Design a protein around this ligand. Structure first.
Ligand SMILES: C[N+](C)(C)C[C@H](O)CC(=O)O
Ligand SMILES: C[N+](C)(C)C[C@H](O)CC(=O)O
Ligand SMILES: C[N+](C)(C)C[C@H](O)CC(=O)O
Ligand code: FES
Ligand code: FES
Ligand code: FES
Ligand SMILES: [Fe+3]
Ligand SMILES: [Fe+3]
Ligand SMILES: [Fe+3]
Lengths: 365, 365, 365
């Protein structure tokens, strides 16, 4: 039988438990989430800076789809499936400046940067060849909140419909987003269900016992997790730390947005880090951890901070979700886990997980 | 349809064939054996020495279950699933001395060494929190014959009920078991069904043509394979060998015990080797090959003997079961293989396989 | 439901599309092709030279079957499944000179080079032992066109019935086949469905934009693709090239033969290259690329030509089929691809793919 959840699941965060374990492991559940969620939701893939000039392009992979996003020669941003309409060879790789046409490496069909077939050698001698039905196949792309979202659902509306108020709130958290520049990217294929990874972001319960240096800057004594409409916001005061961030009143901002992209405006509010979750299968999630600074020339504090994120901070969260994925298959882990919400909605309250899982639940009725 | 065997399968070792090949490869058969056998049988995991002191612990993995076995501060031996009752993080890794409490690396819940939840930060502010239903989840553990068995079946009786007479017989084979100390462990994930591996132990037919040095010490001319009640015993005379064991009348003892742990009391009778089979899936078996000596300081003969087991002896049996697993999927291997039992029950008689497979058969009615 | 194709599929190459994508990826489709095609078709495995002397043997692996082909002491060529009739251990490995008997490494049963059981130790003391039903299990083998084919279907006729006229045509393309000697073998497990790989051979559309040096010798301006009866022939003029073949009127011959072996008689017509496709699963194909020269002592031109094939030529075709396999799973690749046939049947016409896929289609009614 299809694994279905009650609509009220996690509707009361004061008395709630995570999903039954079959939702973090089941291949059947993933195929449903893959199609009902990730193929019909707006997926954040990059900061605007990576696509701000004509011919700039990037490629991404999410739920088995190789996607190209490319700023046309006409400065129009478009996105395409990265597969040739003739025999299915891939078209571009990596990121960079596209040439003025896209030439498929197999049979050298050409496409304008708008996906239109330009020249397909010998096509005028092939009977009934359909040039207009031989273009690159597009999908939707939207620049929102200074970032770039794709949608595989032709009928999708816009990213504001999916995250009402988010751009408005993020621009109050960070006023320099348009100026940010990608400083560093950690790519990691992570053996954990995408929802386990959102779980791990939605709470600060684990800060003290898992993250020394971070918990020393970001004071979770003054910390609140507000829920909204398909996103939430964690904010807290902070001070200079020699185990994380160093050097008036520093602040921390942590937005989770549906389905699984998270935006961080750490202390100082002049830079961002962004976690991108690109699910592969039920126990596999590709993660981008991006560090953005407004200056292209990095200071040492920024580079050192980068290495701190790579070697110290991120490995503690990688190690955590990977062990959780292993443990929740054990017959000793009885089904579900308790979400440690408190009435006060304290800094260590886990109520964030319940808002998230209640939304997920609506895709399993 | 479910693959079922006749109850008389291999009930007459004089005229018997191994399982139809689907029993060494089928994923469906493994899931049944995993649940009907390995989750309801006593599984040997270690010698008593590894758990003789308060706070000593070991971890094992069998049929997808990470297990912790730990001698309490109160000297009581217990075993637990190695997963935290809160979010499912794993609790301990490796082996060693546990601290006085078990602290989960994720959210720092604490547990006494008896599994009881000690302190779960913020729990007194979570509504309806169930502290007694938040302890580590236990399973059964028993010290028998100087070794340690776990059972995932709450209702299990004891290891003597599963191997009647075995401790009695093993203590006559080796009188120094309580004094043994783990001298060396070879860990190998082996691409062979667990039953293929028992198959390879249950006969001496292959000694001559596969194991020069061993067959030169253990004379299989004076060799008998006795069956009992869920175990069997292979014993034979031996002499000093410069290709295996060197330096009144040396003896060899080889006990197979249900489902798949084997105890060896090689010539001299003052040490043991033990094969532990921890099945992973239908074509995958984790193996521990343990060498135990009563002295902690190894002589060179013992260390050299260890290396002999690692580099010479064990690889010949690893290579054998791995090729068999490959070969029995071939359409040229017609279904089953003949068990070369002789009327005399000679040293090279394969009748041991039939006793084993007849017992396995009782789980496929 | 079973994926079935119309019998007329690709019967009109002027208006045709490749298979719906499920035929290059489906596990169910592969199991059918594996059994309805590869277990009932003649499979080319080697040149005659590798098996021309008594006791010469080779092993191959195709669709999960380890096969031994061995020239008896009596000079009779035979083929066997490479698995022992007793316990299923593999019998021979690699290629070389077999001893006068085949001794199984496990229990030392012996077999004459004709598969007959010779001596099975202790067999005269095993009740009802069936020596005649304990021989190596054979399959059909045929030397045709100077090469060696196996057939897993006991009832198969001969290779000429499956490729009428092929030996006759190949001997007109190359008159020195009996003199060829294996100069080099590239083994590659390729992540592409076997049909994708045949696809890539059946056309010259991609020569210009994917293979500089080759397209500079083999002029595809004078190039024709003739279809026949379960094989096709691509031939073209050529000239000396410093980017492929160097140094009266050079010719190129390229035979595809059912199901997926291809024979090349490149310019000069004094050597051959042969592609052997041994499918593993729906997205996996083992490939042998063999270079044959009539001299055992290689000149430098020949060795340099070999390295050209290894490092330059073959990687461009490996990279192509591997990207195609990735791309055709994308939801952006809409189902099928157009086969760029022209009325003229030009050198770049893709009509070859349609002949091939029409034959494949007959196995999915
Ligand atoms: C939201 N919070 C603070 C729990 C997680 C961190 O923001 C993770 C991160 O900054 O990369
Ligand atoms: C029982 N017997 C002798 C066949 C197998 C060997 O005991 C294997 C071993 O000693 O490790
Ligand atoms: C038939 N053709 C020329 C398209 C493919 C090439 O023969 C491939 C090869 O020579 O290895
Ligand atoms: S697959 Fe792109 S041009 Fe042929
Ligand atoms: S998972 Fe163990 S304390 Fe939270
Ligand atoms: S498996 Fe070949 S002799 Fe036993
Ligand atoms: Fe964290
Ligand atoms: Fe052995
Ligand atoms: Fe090519």
């Amino acid at each position: 039988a299809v694994e279905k959840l009650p609509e009220d699941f996690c509707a009361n965060p004061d008395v709630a438990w995570t999903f039954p374990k079959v939702f973090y492991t089941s291949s059947q559940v993933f195929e449903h989430e893959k199609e009902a969620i990730f193929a019909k939701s707006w997926i954040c893939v990059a900061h605007g800076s990576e696509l701000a000039q004509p011919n700039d392009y990037i490629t991404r992979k999410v739920i088995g789809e190789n996607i190209v996003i490319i700023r046309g020669k006409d400065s129009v941003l478009r996105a395409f499936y990265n597969v040739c309409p003739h025999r299915g060879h891939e078209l571009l790789s990596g990121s960079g400046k596209a040439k003025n046409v896209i030439t498929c490496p197999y049979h050298a069909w050409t496409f304008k940067l708008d996906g239109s077939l330009a020249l397909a050698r010998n096509c005028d001698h092939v009977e009934s060849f359909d040039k207009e039905n031989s273009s690159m196949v597009p999908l939707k792309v939207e620049e929102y909140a200074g970032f770039v979202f794709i949608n595989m659902d032709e009928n999708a509306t816009c990213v504001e419909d999916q995250l009402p108020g988010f751009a408005e709130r993020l621009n109050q958290a960070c006023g320099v987003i348009k100026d940010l520049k990608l400083a560093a990217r950690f790519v990691t294929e992570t053996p954990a269900n995408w929802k386990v990874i959102v779980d791990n972001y939605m709470e600060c319960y684990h800060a003290g016992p898992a993250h020394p240096g971070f918990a020393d800057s970001v004071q979770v004594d003054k910390y609140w997790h507000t829920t909204h409409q398909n996103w939430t916001l964690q904010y807290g005061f902070a001070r200079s730390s020699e185990k994380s961030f160093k050097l008036t009143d520093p602040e921390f901002h942590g937005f989770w947005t549906w389905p699984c992209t998270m935006f961080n405006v750490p202390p100082g509010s002049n830079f961002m880090t962004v976690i991108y979750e690109f699910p592969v299968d039920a126990e596999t999630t590709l993660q981008h951890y991006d560090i953005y600074f407004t200056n292209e020339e990095l200071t040492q504090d920024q580079k050192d901070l980068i290495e701190w994120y790579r070697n110290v901070f991120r490995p503690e969260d990688l190690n955590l979700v990977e062990s959780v994925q292993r443990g929740l298959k054990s017959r000793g882990y009885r089904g579900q886990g308790r979400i440690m919400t408190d009435k006060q909605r304290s800094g260590i309250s886990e109520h964030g997980i319940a808002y998230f899982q209640h939304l997920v639940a609506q895709y399993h009725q």
